[PDB]
Design a protein around this nucleic acid. Structure first.
Ligand SMILES: Nc1ccn([C@H]2C[C@H](O)[C@@H](COP(=O)(O)OP(=O)(O)OP(=O)(O)O)O2)c(=O)n1
Ligand SMILES: [Ca+2]
Ligand SMILES: [Ca+2]
Ligand SMILES: [Ca+2]
Ligand SMILES: [Ca+2]
Ligand SMILES: [Ca+2]
Length: 901
DNA sequence: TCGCTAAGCAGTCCGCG
DNA sequence: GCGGACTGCTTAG
């Protein structure tokens, strides 16, 4: 096989590399790598190395990496550019793996672990590690085994061995319901004392040294706790055995308002799953506890136990160990679904970076661009310091707040990467500048043509047309990979809809789900067989279709995230190719594009309708426009349509056959106007929306910018079995909105869009009447909690104290003198509830850690004093008032003359 | 929360005769 | 009460 790296590190003048050799074996080596860097040189000096601007360079080969680093410093001292890859491990990877890396995940040791620490006096601080580690579960991907290290004797209690038999049993049999499919994969090791547990764990670690190390909060908790605990008991040299090169470093992670410490383990790639999830999932969650995320992702119930976690080991050690094992498995289950590890490996190996660098788009693109340029013997420029300066972004049209009955949306494909490729935007393709007219003059095609030679953006920039820049070349490669995965995602989605349709008529028979590839549209044969299947087989197929869609989503959305990240990195001062001229060339071109095409669509539709100056485009944001289709529908007349699907087909055909060709013509003219290198403004129909035929539904509404709701029948070619609400920006979409309130507001919107005013009034009356019965957690607001200390003046709110922070201060007073009570953690999320006048907490609200029940110490009082009235007005009534006012609708029936009978 | 801009709403403080 | 200046937070893209 082709060899591939696992990890790479620089330690002084040595590169330490763990890799898979040509026989599939894991190896380690120390290489005394001599790096090269570059200086500009005279024309007369014949060279094969040129900087990105075509200026000649001489290569300087250093005796060692420290010499190269010293040279960089001296060049700064002199005031001359030191060119080349200054991150020597990336240069090493480039030299050692000079080909597209083909990797084999089955040879990469992926370790998933979780530790337990019993702590009487509150949260066990990983920098102190003052409490024994009493359980470790460590899953190894190569062995496919869960290794359980169980401490039976502790100063906090001696316990009996954990029983796998009881663990397997149902909760209803007194068991722990450890999933049967992992029961045979558990390797249980009880220990008489902590020292032998930890020593054996290190020997195990040495035999089975993780390459990728993950779990939940492993970087912020488990890793530093294990390191520091071993350090405290045995000394530093023993703790450093967690590194295959015996090198570790305390790394201080700084933010706006403080800092924290993590432990860097040289020769290991830590990908904490909580951070992979935050980066790659595109969710914003009210809580990031593993129980909360597992419930959300997997629909598995919360792990239930009695008493506080600090007494679980002594009261129920059996459950304590079982829950440690389940915790590790939950993460593997999330990954089986989301496939973020697979994604990280794909991106890391593509860029030729340390796998953990996937968290940094700057580092990822730096390595991609470096490798690409190196292929042509070109030399990368030195990074420079730049002051942070704001720059303009996208255009967002101000909508007229209203109901909108029939709506068709159109969307530019991968806008910013397409702009980059179209205009040819790159550090080395800058050709010069032209005199800019106001943007509106370009939008209306009245400004002078920028250039007859170069490719232009309306910010005043001109670019070469003879050859692609490195940024367009490399962005195109990832754009093209994404396209394939988006295709699989959309096919799986369409396939899902076929199964949902068939589920209306399940057959009374015993059968199996079909063995099919959900990444490809079902053939007619598969479709025939589906129509004959039972509900059991159909639901199983639906689950699989949906899992395939998720896999496609992960692969495609994060590839999109990376290429959009390149556009954004051009405006980050730490990027090697930072240039506000280029960053702004992209965004300003985007503003023109959207407003240019708005004008073109209005002009086209006014022509077909035989009108003048009517606004068909009701809204736009960045890369999309929303077109009112009422007049198109009315031109044939609603009576002419057999059903909803009939007018959806008609609008689908109108968009594809009439509007898209008109949009294309409009954008080709714009390309010529800007003299761009290649026309790549591809704007396709996105959504078709409206009320069910013959209903009183309003179809859609806008309240303002980035705030709207549509009843959608077709999205990007997916024809839904049932209409889907597309709600953007409204309170139903915000993690801050109470769970039950999101749900109620969503149903109010559904009724508005699908059924009309009377249906809405019916539901509102019932909700208002019954909501006081809702569970307190379901009606609590959520907020991130920053700067708690800043606003804390002797336990009371300081000037300008935010509402959620006030609530935390209230909580803190109420739990004062309890080392046991859960503490609110700076920077994390809290639930927030309002309190009625004259309550014993002495303030108008209380807040406690999100994803948890409030402590029993005060729960009864909180429930008794909760202000339901304030809760309802603020979270439900006020947003609903916004929705209905915009839609020109009433949520309460107004009095009429009919009331007199 | 270690790892692009536009823009919405909640809440504080205080003016507005 | 509402709105503007301001902080804080969370969206859409
Ligand atoms: N983090 C982000 C997100 C978006 N955008 C900009 C660039 C995008 O091109 C544009 C629209 O983003 P979308 O994700 O809505 O869709 P794209 O057009 O990028 O991709 P698709 O091909 O899915 O339409 O907004 C950005 O600069 N940075
Ligand atoms: Ca735990
Ligand atoms: Ca788009
Ligand atoms: Ca599209
Ligand atoms: Ca059937
Ligand atoms: Ca869009």
């Amino acid at each position: 096989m082709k060899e591939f790296y696992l990890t790479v590190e620089q330690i002084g003048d040595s590169i330490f590399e763990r890799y898979i050799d040509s026989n599939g074996r894991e190896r380690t080596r120390e290489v005394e790598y001599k790096p090269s860097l570059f200086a500009h040189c005279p024309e007369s000096q014949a060279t094969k190395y040129f900087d990105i601007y075509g200026k000649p360079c001489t290569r300087k080969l250093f005796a060692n990496m420290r010499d190269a680093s010293q040279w960089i410093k001296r060049m700064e001292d002199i005031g001359l550019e030191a060119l080349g890859m200054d991150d020597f491990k990336l240069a090493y990877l480039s030299d050692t793996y000079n080909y597209e890396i083909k990797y084999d995940h089955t040879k990469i040791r992926v370790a998933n672990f979780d530790i337990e620490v019993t702590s009487p006096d509150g949260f066990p601080e990983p920098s102190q590690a003052k409490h024994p580690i009493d359980a470790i579960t460590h899953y190894d991907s190569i062995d496919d085994r869960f290794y359980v290290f169980d401490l039976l004797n502790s100063p906090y209690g001696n316990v009996e061995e954990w029983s796998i038999e009881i663990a397997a049993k149902l909760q209803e049999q007194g068991g722990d319901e450890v999933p049967s499919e992992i029961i045979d994969k558990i390797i249980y090791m009880p220990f008489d004392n902590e020292k032998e547990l930890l020593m054996e764990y290190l020997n195990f670690w040495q035999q089975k040294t993780p390459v990728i190390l993950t779990g939940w909060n492993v970087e912020s908790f488990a890793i530093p706790y294990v390191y520091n605990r071993i350090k405290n008991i045995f000394g530093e040299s023993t703790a450093k055995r967690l590194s295959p090169h015996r090198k570790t470093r305390v790394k201080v992670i700084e933010n706006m308002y403080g800092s924290r410490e993590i432990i860097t383990l040289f020769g290991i790639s830590v990908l904490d799953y909580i951070d992979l999830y935050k980066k790659f999932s595109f969710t914003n969650q009210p809580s990031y506890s593993l129980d909360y995320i597992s419930e959300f992702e997997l629909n598995v119930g919360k792990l239930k136990y009695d008493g506080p976690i600090s007494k679980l080991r002594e009261s129920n050690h059996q459950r304590y160990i079982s829950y440690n094992i389940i915790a590790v498995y939950r993460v593997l289950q999330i990954d089986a679904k989301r496939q973020f590890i697979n994604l990280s490996l794909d991106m890391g190996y593509y860029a030729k970076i340390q796998i953990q660098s996937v968290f940094s788009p700057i580092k990822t693109w730096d390595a991609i661009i470096f490798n690409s340029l190196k292929e042509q013997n070109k030399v990368i420029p030195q990074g420079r310091s730049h002051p942070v300066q704001p720059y303009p972004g996208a255009f967002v049209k101000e909508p007229i707040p209203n109901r909108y009955k029939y709506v068709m949306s159109f969307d530019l494909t991968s806008l910013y990467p397409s702009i980059i490729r179209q205009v040819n935007i790159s550090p080395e393709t800058i050709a010069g500048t032209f005199k800019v007219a106001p943007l509106h003059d370009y939008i209306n095609a009245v400004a002078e043509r920028p250039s007859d030679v170069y490719s232009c953006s309306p910010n005043g920039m001109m670019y070469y047309k003879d050859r692609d820049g490195v940024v367009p070349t490399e962005i195109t490669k990832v754009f093209n990979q994404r396209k394939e995965h988006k295709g699989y995602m959309l096919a799986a989605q369409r396939n899902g809809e076929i199964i949902k349709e068939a589920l209306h008529n399940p057959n009374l028979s015993v059968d199996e789900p079909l063995d099919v590839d959900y990444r490809f549209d079902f053939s007619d044969e598969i479709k025939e067989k589906i129509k004959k299947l039972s509900a059991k087989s159909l639901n199983e197929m639906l689950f699989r279709a949906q899992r395939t869609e998720v896999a496609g989503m992960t692969a495609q959305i994060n590839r999109k995230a990376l290429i959009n990240g390149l556009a954004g990195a051009l405006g980050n001062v730490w990027f090697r190719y930072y240039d506000l001229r280029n960053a702004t060339a992209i965004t300003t071109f985007g503003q023109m594009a959207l407003q240019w095409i708005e004008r073109k669509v209005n002009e086209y539709l006014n022509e077909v309708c035989g009108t003048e100056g009517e606004a068909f485009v009701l809204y736009g944001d960045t890369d999309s426009i929303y077109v009112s289709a009422d007049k198109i529908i009315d031109k044939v007349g609603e009576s002419k349509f057999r059903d909803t699907n009939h007018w959806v087909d008609f609008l689908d055909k109108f968009a594809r056959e009439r509007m898209e060709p008109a949009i294309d013509r409009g954008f080709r003219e714009m390309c010529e106007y800007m003299n761009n290198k290649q026309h790549l403004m591809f704007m396709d129909r996105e959504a078709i929306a409206g009320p069910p035929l013959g209903s009183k539904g309003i179809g859609g509404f806008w309240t303002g910018k980035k705030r709207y709701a549509l009843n959608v029948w077709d999205m990007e070619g997916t024809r839904y079995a049932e209409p889907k609400l597309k709600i953007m920006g409204l309170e139903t979409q915000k993690s801050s909105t109470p769970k039950a309130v999101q749900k109620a507001l969503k149903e109010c919107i559904r009724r508005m869009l699908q059924e009309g005013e009377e249906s809405l009034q019916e539901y509102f009356k019932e909700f208002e009447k019954e909501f006081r019965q809702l569970n307190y957690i379901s009606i609590a607001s959520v907020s991130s909690a920053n700067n708690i200390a800043k606003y804390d003046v002797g336990g009371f709110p300081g000037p300008k104290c935010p509402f959620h922070i006030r609530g935390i201060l209230t909580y803190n007073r109420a739990i004062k003198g309890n080392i046991d009570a859960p503490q609110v953690v700076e920077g994390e999320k809290v639930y927030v509830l309002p309190l009625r006048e004259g309550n014993p907490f002495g303030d108008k609200c209380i807040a406690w850690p999100s994803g948890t029940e409030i402590t029993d110490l005060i729960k009864d009082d909180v429930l008794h004093w909760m202000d339901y009235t304030v809760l309802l007005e603020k979270t439900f009534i006020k947003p609903l008032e916004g929705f209905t006012s915009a839609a020109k609708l009433d949520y309460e029936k107004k009095a009429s003359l009919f009331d007199m009978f």
